[PDB]
Design a protein around this ligand. Structure first.
Ligand SMILES: Nc1ncnc2c1ncn2[C@@H]1O[C@H](COP(=O)(O)OP(=O)(O)O)[C@@H](O)[C@H]1O
Ligand SMILES: Nc1ncnc2c1ncn2[C@@H]1O[C@H](COP(=O)(O)OP(=O)(O)O)[C@@H](O)[C@H]1O
Ligand SMILES: Nc1ncnc2c1ncn2[C@@H]1O[C@H](COP(=O)(O)OP(=O)(O)O)[C@@H](O)[C@H]1O
Ligand SMILES: [Mg+2]
Ligand SMILES: [Mg+2]
Ligand SMILES: [Mg+2]
Lengths: 372, 372, 372
């Protein structure tokens, strides 16, 4: 095929474009927004739903919903709006002409992948499609055939060990804590300095505070003490409406939830201990090359100082007789998409698409025998 | 010592008294009022501020300011008048002798608790003090150690899940909608029957209408349809000056803003979905016992029919396989003060006070290590 | 003496009682749990650690730890709590007074048996004690002196060939796969139907889903084809909180990990191949009588159909010329404790105890010369 789509149908943000390009043609919020107020002006574009950057622009009059929660599509009537928008509004393709790579977290419900397959063949009529694991696509962007990938988006953090191009599915870890839970935790702790952000539209203002100002502190208890001898670690943000909020230790106490999940009251290992536990579930001879090829992917891996702390923490867990290396590239915000754009372009991948002809003789249950 | 004080300095109404008493010694509006008109009579007790029942009595010539908004003290020089009035006028104590239990809503600004601590030790010179969460105190009055507490006052509604004595602070919810927002909404919908209530003194008249006549409809659309075949659900109230107002569906459409916050334009879950979401944020093993111990507290829970509406709605959200029970005691107007009167009286609590000697070696920051 | 104790301190279930009783006096989870949330109800039985049925009862607010992993005591400070609980809280004996039969898996670390001896003689001051192999104790409960015991608990599966009362230790097999690995795989594969169990208390919900509903298929690929023409093999289970989960092929696909360990990603023989390998490591004359006397033991041997799958699988490996019989008593859940109660009650065993004198002249190293 000349061109195929790769759609990274992520939680919170969707990345889309053509296989063989080096970056997404489109990136926009994975949001559908609906009016919450009385419409009074006739003779106007009174539209019953907005999606992506349209919903983000009009958000003061909208309730904003994400159809994807924790990497699982929880609203299919609105996920069809996000895929319709993706194909017809800023890729501006005919889906009937282009096969599509699609993207999923490990350990998802099987019904998610089946219903994602059924919609692509029966609503969008694609020639062929395939659903790929986000952490396998991250090694394609990095150019590896071995590494443990820590992929962390808006809804899920997951670890996938790979060695010599074989995955270890018994050692895959999933953690329902990534960018949305950090945004919600920042809304919670910003209340303690006096700022109430409570609506779905204000949740997007706090996501921008988090992205602009938050960081991961190399030693948290020393940083907490450094912020008690105050004013040096503080920054300020200017809200829509032009009011300013000053922000202090909540600037690094927020991303620490990744390393201390008990801040959001959940009982789990932190992301450093989840990467270590996943390496220690692997066969002993591969562990040396996994510690040396520790790949980071996805937007929740974009905090300043997170790779320095991930190296510090895996180095304290692992035996000191060997070298941990953290491979967090500057474009890792898109490595799942870039690696899907590599996979969908390979000549040896063109045999692996599920085709329309192969779906309509096997039903949506085809997707489990033909995809990892 | 034989007595501590306990003060529930809530929005709208202060409750004050001695630890181990059965009910508050003093209960009065959390109001300061100042003359809005020209004094002309020389040779009189002409006075620059009135507080509590003196403000409420003289209100026809006053502008009334509540110094607490949404559970946050917004006017500290008037809050010092309210604590001065509390201690010296109708408790008629000397704060220098009595340690005082104070009370706060969850998810408050930290500056509120610090400045309240500072006033208690540096302005009122108390021997010791503590700040307790209003919903944690409500279980002591109820005699539970497990339950989800809906507390709803004049300024704030909040849900605190507790199991076997442990709070789950991830599952705590705060909603900035309670009895003041329902008074302001009743003022607004009374305009549509042709009564204009607009001054701060008239807000008290509409608060008295809300207290005497309003109730929660068990099924709102059936009660709207009932009141449209009118005159059966209508009641009358006699204003000061003796003019009678007749009031109809606005009588139950006011309390319905607790279940439908969109009536006052705010995008949030009603008190039933806020309680159910707080139970569902808790660990799966405790939910069965939170549903059976759903405790209601504060004056905004005093409406006729709210326990029945709230049981009906949590029963519709919960799985049909188990028994929701709602514990709305008749003294729940005071269950925060009654609970604080138990707590301050316990022998095993006497280690927990912040003492003056421990404050003046740690500053007002002490209240974040000794209090929840 | 009148009575010894016998304590089968297994992984995740501790069985305890007196020699000559017909069944364990006490059975409880081999668990210690500590609070993970914040204590707010002052003046109550708040406590820093719960053990056994207290921990299993309060588990919604606790993180639950097992101090035995794969038959090895990994946390001695919490194993001392379990032995203290066993003796004082529901045997309610004086350990100073009764000699104790303890129990162990074969091919354990020698430090496990030494430290277990040292704790018994110095923390619990016992008169005398012994450590017996769980599989040898399973033959006493069966009335045999020859058989091969397949014992499978929570932590470890092991085969021990015995002929005319002599063990063949070169033919002993150990397999660090049993009931916990099956629970942890059921948590993994329930995720693919959309139920996410992840906390240490949700591991106890998935353990009951496994115990109530899981079973062993006689022909796995035929049962998989039977569950694909669905609904006949599905069952439903009600969780705490009253939600119901339906479960289908994951019902028999969980126990198949015993026959296909590659499901949990480990390279090993199944329990049938391990039993056949253990028989084939024995001398050629004894094999006829081992095939006729396969003894099932421990709780992971309790699935419906496991004895029929096991007899079908050993019959396919063994020569067709001779009788495979598998002996699977309904009391096999306790046969290690039952046969420990027999051993501890024999008049000929009363000279085989390690005594306090014989320990305190030889150190904890005494246990290697006097036990198996
Ligand atoms: N510079 C940044 N710092 C912190 N967080 C970021 C940054 N950029 C993006 N994010 C967060 O990454 C999350 C989603 O990124 P992405 O990797 O696209 O996830 P998904 O694949 O689920 O769409 C968002 O919640 C966003 O807040
Ligand atoms: N019988 C009643 N019916 C309806 N509302 C009431 C009743 N009694 C009191 N209220 C309302 O309760 C609110 C405050 O009660 P309270 O629980 O003391 O709150 P706070 O703790 O904020 O002072 C007031 O706004 C008042 O209007
Ligand atoms: N009826 C049953 N079906 C399946 N598994 C069971 C059943 N009863 C108990 N088990 C499992 O047996 C395991 C432990 O049993 P037990 O033989 O006491 O082991 P241990 O000796 O290690 O305590 C537990 O993991 C439990 O889940
Ligand atoms: Mg992603
Ligand atoms: Mg109150
Ligand atoms: Mg056992």
């Amino acid at each position: 095929e000349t061109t195929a789509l790769v759609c990274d149908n992520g939680s919170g943000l969707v990345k889309a474009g053509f296989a063989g390009d080096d970056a997404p043609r489109a990136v926009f919020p994975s949001i559908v927004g609906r009016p919450r107020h009385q419409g009074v002006m006739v003779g106007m574009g009174q539209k019953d739903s907005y999606v992506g950057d349209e919903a983000q622009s009009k958000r003061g009059i909208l309730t904003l919903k994400y159809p994807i929660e924790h990497g699982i599509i929880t609203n299919w009537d609105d996920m069809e709006k996000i895929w319709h928008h993706t194909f017809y509004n800023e890729l501006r393709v005919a889906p009937e002409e282009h096969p599509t790579l699609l993207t999923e977290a490990p350990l998802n419900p099987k019904a998610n992948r089946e219903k994602m397959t059924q919609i692509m063949f029966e609503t969008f009529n694609v020639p062929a499609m395939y659903v790929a694991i986000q952490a396998v696509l991250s090694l394609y962007a990095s150019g590896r055939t071995t590494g443990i990938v820590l992929d962390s988006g808006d809804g899920v953090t997951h670890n996938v060990p790979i060695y010599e191009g074989y995955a270890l599915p018994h050692a895959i870890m999933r953690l329902d804590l990534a960018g949305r839970d950090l945004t919600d935790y920042l809304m919670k702790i910003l209340t303690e300095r006096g700022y109430s952000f409570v609506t779905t539209a204000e949740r997007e203002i706090v996501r921008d505070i988090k992205e602009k100002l938050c960081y991961v502190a190399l030693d948290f208890e020393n940083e907490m003490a450094t912020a008690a001898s105050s004013s040096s670690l503080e920054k300020s943000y200017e809200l829509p409406d032009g009011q300013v909020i000053t922000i202090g230790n909540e600037r690094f106490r927020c991303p620490e939830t990744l390393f201390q999940p008990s801040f959001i009251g959940m009982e789990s290992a932190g992301i450093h201990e989840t990467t270590y536990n996943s390496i220690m579930k692997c066969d002993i001879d591969i562990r040396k090359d996994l510690y040396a090829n520790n790949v980071m992917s996805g937007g929740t891996t974009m905090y300043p100082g997170i790779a320095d702390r991930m190296q510090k923490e895996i180095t304290a867990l692992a035996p000191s007789t060997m070298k941990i290396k953290i491979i967090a590239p500057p474009e890792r915000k898109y490595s799942v998409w870039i690696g899907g754009s590599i996979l969908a372009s390979l000549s040896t991948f063109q045999q692996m698409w599920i085709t329309k002809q192969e779906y309509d003789e096997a039903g949506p249950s085809i997707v489990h025998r033909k995809c990892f």
